[PDB]
């Protein structure tokens, strides 16, 4: 079974009922642990990754007034050891902290079946009010944060081996 | 299920009774603590830092005529100051504590009495008569007393990082570093 | 015979066996694990381990925190390839 892998037997814990579930655990991961954690914890990655990837073009493309002079010509991992002393990634990590402490809560609700994962009720502007469209929105984010977080693996890396930030590698190479 | 933290459970204890409730608990002390007892202390910080921002913002600005009186920066002023004056103060606010409490000032014996949490009595001009008035007003006392509690926490430390005074220090803020 | 009852933590099951092999529930989070799984897993911890080992029995003065961390799989494997042996034995 296992649509995706079509030689493996389909993942036990995996039943299709997940958004983006499409059989895929070659080696057997969901087995162990509670799969309700692994969503969430992909959740956070996506989101987090794809957040990082649209960064890592929007800083190559533009940076804010004055933060030229501090990080001379820093890229990526570069631009965050820089700032580390000056001390922006310490505050962004307390902040960042503070949600995470809340989020920890959550995680603790959704063990429990209360809350369902990656779930934090943020919808502002209202987008999702109809359930297809709320389906086809959580089938879109699952699908662009992986895309995501390989895209984000990709920048960094290029960026080791070249020094080089996306955007500015793709204009030239 | 809570109005504050929408994707947490509403906390058992907080069910709308007592004014400012929006459901506000993530850390679940209101199970481990009586509620009552918390209120208490939420109040007793407010008012004391309300009025410790006034203090700080209207002593960067006016200063008693004694030179050891005369500190823009509310830290330094602490220390520039005598110290019996000080030691003055914490005896008279020890002797208000015990007599606005009536002795009975524990966890286990400050509401043996039966009066409501943040109620010490203290309503000289009697602007409680009308009790609409009274109900917002409770709001606000919390309201402003929170607002009054983060707003002192950013003076104090503002004060120790440039060691100039609350509006001094917002005026002169270094945009080229 | 009047002594309080003994509090255990939530979800504590009976792991007493007397069978060829325990329950599957003495492995916890890995009890739906297959036995291939934890074959696989053994071996491949062993090597690692083996590896990122011998890459730090002369320890410097600044060893690699991955090496460190790797070794650390030797270990592992024997609880893996023990969890094998348990998985294979009791219907997996
Ligand atoms: C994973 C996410 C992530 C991380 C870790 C960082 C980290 C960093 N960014 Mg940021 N950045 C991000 C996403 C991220 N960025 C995104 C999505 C954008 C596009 C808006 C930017 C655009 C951006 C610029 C233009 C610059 C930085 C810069 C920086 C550095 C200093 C902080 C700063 O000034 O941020 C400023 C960033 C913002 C004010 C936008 C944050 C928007 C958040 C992530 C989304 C909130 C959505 C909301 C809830 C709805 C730091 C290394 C500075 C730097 O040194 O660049 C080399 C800088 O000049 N970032
Ligand atoms: C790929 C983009 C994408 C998509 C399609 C969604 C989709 C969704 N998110 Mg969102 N989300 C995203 C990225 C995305 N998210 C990111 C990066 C973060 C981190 C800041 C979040 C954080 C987040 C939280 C905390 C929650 C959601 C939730 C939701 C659901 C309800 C809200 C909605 O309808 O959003 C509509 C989505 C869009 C209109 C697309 C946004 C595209 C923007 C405008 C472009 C970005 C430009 C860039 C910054 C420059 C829905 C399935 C809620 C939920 O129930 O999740 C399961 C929820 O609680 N999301
Ligand atoms: C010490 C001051 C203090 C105290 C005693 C209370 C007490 C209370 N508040 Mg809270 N509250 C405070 C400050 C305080 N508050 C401030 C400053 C704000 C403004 C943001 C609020 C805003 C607020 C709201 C909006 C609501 C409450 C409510 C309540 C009640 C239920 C929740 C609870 O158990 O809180 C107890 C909380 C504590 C004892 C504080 C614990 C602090 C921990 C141990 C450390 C905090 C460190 C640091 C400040 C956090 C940032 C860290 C950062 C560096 C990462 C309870 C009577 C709810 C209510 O009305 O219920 C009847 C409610 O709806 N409060
Ligand atoms: C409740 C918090 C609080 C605390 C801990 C202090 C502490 C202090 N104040 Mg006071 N002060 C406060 C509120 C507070 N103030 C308020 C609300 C006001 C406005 C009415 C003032 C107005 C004020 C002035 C004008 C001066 C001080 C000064 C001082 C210092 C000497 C004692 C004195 O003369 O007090 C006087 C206290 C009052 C007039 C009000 C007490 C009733 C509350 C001392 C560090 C002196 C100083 O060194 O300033 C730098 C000084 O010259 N304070
Ligand atoms: C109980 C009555 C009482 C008495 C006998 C004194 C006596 C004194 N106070 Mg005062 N003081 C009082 C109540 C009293 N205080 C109250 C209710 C407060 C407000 C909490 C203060 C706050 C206060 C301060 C802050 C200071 C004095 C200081 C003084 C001394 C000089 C001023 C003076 O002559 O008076 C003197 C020993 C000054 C001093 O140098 O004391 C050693 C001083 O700095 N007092
Ligand atoms: C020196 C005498 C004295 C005495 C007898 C008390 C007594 C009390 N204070 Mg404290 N308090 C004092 C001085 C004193 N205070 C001073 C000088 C300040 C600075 C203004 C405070 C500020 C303060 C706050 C902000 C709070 C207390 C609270 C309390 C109560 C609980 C204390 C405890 O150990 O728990 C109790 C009524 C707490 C309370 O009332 O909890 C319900 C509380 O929240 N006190
Ligand atoms: C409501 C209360 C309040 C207010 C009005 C302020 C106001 C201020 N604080 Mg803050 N502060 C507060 C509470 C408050 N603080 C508390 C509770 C703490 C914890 C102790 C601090 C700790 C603190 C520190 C350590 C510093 C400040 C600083 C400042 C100043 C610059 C902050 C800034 O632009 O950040 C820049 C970032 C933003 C404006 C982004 C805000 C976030 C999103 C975009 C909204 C400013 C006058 C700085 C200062 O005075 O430097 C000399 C400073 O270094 N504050
Ligand atoms: C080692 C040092 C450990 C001491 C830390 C003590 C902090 C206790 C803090 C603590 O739990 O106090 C909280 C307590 C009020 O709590 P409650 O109202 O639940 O009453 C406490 C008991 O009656 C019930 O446990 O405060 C008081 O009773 C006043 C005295 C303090
Ligand atoms: C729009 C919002 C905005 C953001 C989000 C933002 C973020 C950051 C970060 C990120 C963590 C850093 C690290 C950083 C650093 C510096 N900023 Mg900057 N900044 C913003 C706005 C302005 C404006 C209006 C000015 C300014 C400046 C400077 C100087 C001065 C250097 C010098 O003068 O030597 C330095 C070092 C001033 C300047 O010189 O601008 C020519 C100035 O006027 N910024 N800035
Ligand atoms: C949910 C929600 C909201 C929201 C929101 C927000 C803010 C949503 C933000 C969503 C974002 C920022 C999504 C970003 C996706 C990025 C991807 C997929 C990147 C892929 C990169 C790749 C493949 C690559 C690459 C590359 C590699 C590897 C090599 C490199 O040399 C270059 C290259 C490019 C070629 C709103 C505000 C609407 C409110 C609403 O009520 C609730
Ligand atoms: C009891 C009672 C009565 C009464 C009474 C009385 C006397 C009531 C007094 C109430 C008072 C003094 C309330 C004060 C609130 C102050 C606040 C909220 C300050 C916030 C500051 C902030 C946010 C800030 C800040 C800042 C920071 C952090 C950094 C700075 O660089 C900049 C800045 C300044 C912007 C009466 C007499 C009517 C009788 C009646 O029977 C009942």
């Given at each position: 079974?296992?649509?995706?892998?079509?030689?493996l037997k389909?993942?036990?814990?995996?039943?299709?009922?997940?958004?983006?579930?499409?059989?895929?655990?070659?080696?057997?991961?969901?087995s162990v642990?509670?799969?309700?954690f692994?969503?969430?914890?992909?959740l956070?990655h996506?989101r987090?990754?794809?957040?990082?990837?649209?960064?890592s073009?929007?800083?190559?493309?533009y940076?804010?007034?004055?933060?030229?002079?501090?990080?001379?010509?820093?890229?990526?991992?570069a631009v965050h050891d820089?700032?580390?002393?000056?001390?922006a990634?310490?505050?962004?990590?307390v902040?960042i902290?503070?949600?995470?402490?809340?989020?920890?809560?959550?995680?603790?609700?959704?063990?429990?079946?209360?809350?369902?994962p990656?779930?934090?009720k943020?919808d502002?502007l209202?987008?999702?009010?109809?359930?297809?469209?709320?389906?086809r929105?959580?089938?879109?984010?699952?699908?662009?944060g992986?895309?995501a977080?390989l895209?984000?693996?990709?920048?960094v890396?290029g960026?080791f081996?070249?020094?080089?930030?996306?955007?500015?590698?793709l204009?030239?190479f | 299920?809570?109005?504050?933290?929408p994707f947490?459970?509403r906390p058992?204890?907080?069910?709308?009774?007592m004014v400012?409730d929006?459901?506000?608990?993530?850390?679940?002390?209101?199970g481990?603590?009586?509620l009552?007892?918390?209120?208490?202390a939420?109040l007793?910080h407010?008012?004391?830092?309300?009025?410790?921002?006034?203090g700080?913002?209207?002593?960067?600005?006016?200063h008693?005529?004694?030179?050891?009186?005369?500190n823009?920066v509310?830290?330094?002023?602490?220390?520039?100051?005598?110290?019996?004056?000080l030691?003055?103060?914490?005896?008279?606010?020890?002797v208000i504590?015990?007599?606005?409490?009536?002795?009975?000032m524990?966890?286990?014996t400050?509401f043996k009495?039966?009066r409501?949490?943040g109620?010490?009595?203290?309503?000289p001009?009697?602007f409680?008569?009308?009790?609409?008035?009274?109900?917002?007003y409770?709001l606000?006392?919390?309201?402003?007393?929170?607002?009054?509690?983060?707003?002192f926490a950013?003076?104090?430390?503002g004060?120790?990082?440039?060691?100039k005074?609350?509006?001094?220090?917002?005026?002169?803020?270094?945009?080229?570093? | 015979?009047?002594?309080?009852?003994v509090?255990?933590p939530?979800?504590?099951?009976?792991?007493?066996?007397?069978?060829?092999?325990?329950?599957?529930?003495?492995l916890?989070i890995?009890k739906?694990?297959?036995?291939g799984?934890?074959?696989?897993?053994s071996?491949?911890?062993?090597?690692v381990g083996?590896?990122?080992?011998?890459?730090?029995?002369?320890?410097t003065?600044?060893p690699?925190?991955?090496?460190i961390?790797?070794?650390?799989?030797?270990?592992?494997?024997?609880?893996?390839?023990?969890?094998?042996?348990?998985?294979?034995?009791?219907?997996?």
């Amino acid at each position: 079974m296992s649509p995706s892998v079509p030689f493996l037997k389909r993942p036990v814990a995996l039943d299709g009922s997940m958004v983006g579930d499409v059989g895929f655990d070659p080696l057997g991961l969901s087995s162990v642990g509670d799969i309700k954690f692994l969503r969430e914890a992909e959740l956070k990655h996506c989101r987090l990754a794809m957040l990082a990837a649209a960064g890592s073009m929007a800083q190559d493309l533009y940076t804010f007034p004055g933060v030229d002079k501090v990080i001379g010509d820093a890229k990526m991992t570069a631009v965050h050891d820089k700032l580390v002393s000056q001390g922006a990634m310490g505050q962004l990590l307390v902040w960042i902290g503070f949600a995470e402490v809340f989020a920890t809560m959550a995680l603790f609700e959704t063990l429990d079946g209360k809350r369902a994962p990656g779930d934090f009720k943020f919808d502002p502007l209202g987008f999702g009010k109809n359930p297809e469209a709320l389906k086809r929105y959580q089938l879109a984010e699952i699908k662009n944060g992986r895309l995501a977080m390989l895209g984000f693996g990709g920048m960094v890396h290029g960026y080791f081996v070249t020094g080089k930030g996306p955007l500015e590698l793709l204009t030239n190479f | 299920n809570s109005a504050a933290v929408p994707f947490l459970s509403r906390p058992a204890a907080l069910d709308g009774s007592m004014v400012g409730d929006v459901g506000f608990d993530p850390l679940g002390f209101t199970g481990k603590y009586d509620l009552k007892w918390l209120r208490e202390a939420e109040l007793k910080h407010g008012r004391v830092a309300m009025l410790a921002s006034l203090g700080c913002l209207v002593q960067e600005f006016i200063h008693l005529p004694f030179e050891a009186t005369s500190n823009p920066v509310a830290s330094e002023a602490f220390f520039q100051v005598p110290s019996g004056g000080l030691w003055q103060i914490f005896t008279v606010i020890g002797v208000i504590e015990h007599v606005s409490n009536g002795f009975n000032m524990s966890g286990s014996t400050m509401f043996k009495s039966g009066r409501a949490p943040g109620n010490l009595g203290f309503d000289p001009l009697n602007f409680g008569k009308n009790p609409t008035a009274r109900a917002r007003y409770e709001l606000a006392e919390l309201k402003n007393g929170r607002l009054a509690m983060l707003g002192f926490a950013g003076m104090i430390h503002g004060c120790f990082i440039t060691g100039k005074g609350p509006l001094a220090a917002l005026t002169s803020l270094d945009w080229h570093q | 015979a009047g002594y309080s009852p003994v509090p255990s933590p939530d979800n504590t099951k009976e792991t007493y066996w007397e069978t060829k092999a325990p329950s599957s529930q003495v492995l916890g989070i890995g009890k739906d694990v297959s036995s291939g799984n934890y074959i696989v897993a053994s071996v491949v911890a062993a090597v690692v381990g083996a590896a990122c080992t011998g890459q730090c029995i002369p320890l410097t003065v600044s060893p690699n925190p991955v090496f460190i961390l790797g070794s650390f799989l030797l270990p592992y494997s024997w609880a893996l390839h023990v969890a094998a042996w348990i998985q294979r034995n009791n219907g997996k």
